[PDB]
Amino acid sequence: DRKEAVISLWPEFAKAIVSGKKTVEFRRRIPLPALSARIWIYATRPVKSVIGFAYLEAIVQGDVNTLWSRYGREAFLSEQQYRDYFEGTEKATAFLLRDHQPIRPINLDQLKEIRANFQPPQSLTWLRKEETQKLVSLTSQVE
């Protein structure tokens, strides 16, 4: 079961996902969540918090050039940032996201209380079902 995952992004991109501006997330060799998985968004420093989530509506696997042409507009990052991220490979994975949901940020200390040695994932981290319950139990509307 892979219905609940956390990924890290720099705060401008994280905020773009939870606001619905960024509906495509590009990745390089990442484990695949089950369809309609909830993808939690950890925004990196200085935010250092889970700031919301979105749902995985589709997974695309393709070449880097064509994926930029087809989905780059929904991905928010610049073409240079994209090509830098994919330097040295011609393969690319695109997560297509829907139903973005901002929340009051959940800080790194709370995440550590949930999982004692939580670290911002470099690719993705699965949530255990109890972890998912504790996290959901912390969720609130943005202030």
Torsions phi, psi of 120, nearest 5? -60, 120
Q: What is the dihedral of CA 114, 119, 124, 130, to 10 degrees?
A: -10
Give the resolution in Å: 1.7
Q: What is the DSSP letter of 78?
A: -
3-state secondary structure of 38: strand
Alpha carbon of residue 55 to chain centroid: 10
Helix, coil or strand: residue 119: coil
Containing structural domain, residue 83: 1-143
CA-to-CA dists, residue 36 to 55, 69, 98, 100, 127, angstroms? 6, 25, 9, 12, 15
* Local structure of residue 59 (DSSP, 8 states): E
What would the two tokens of residue 22 be? 């960024």
Q: How many distinct structural domains can be found in the chain?
A: 1
**b/e string for 15-49 if b means 16 or more Cβ within 10 A?**
bbbbeeebbbbbbeebeebeeebbbbbbbeeebbb
How many Å apart are CA 92 and CA 16, to the nearest integer?
A: 20
Q: Is the distance from CB of 122 to CB of 7 less than 8 angstroms?
A: no
Cα–Cα distance measured from residue 107 to residue 42, given in angstroms and rounded to the nearest whole number: 9
Could you say which DSSP state residue 87 is in? T
Elucidation technique: X-ray
Strand, helix or coil for residue 121: coil
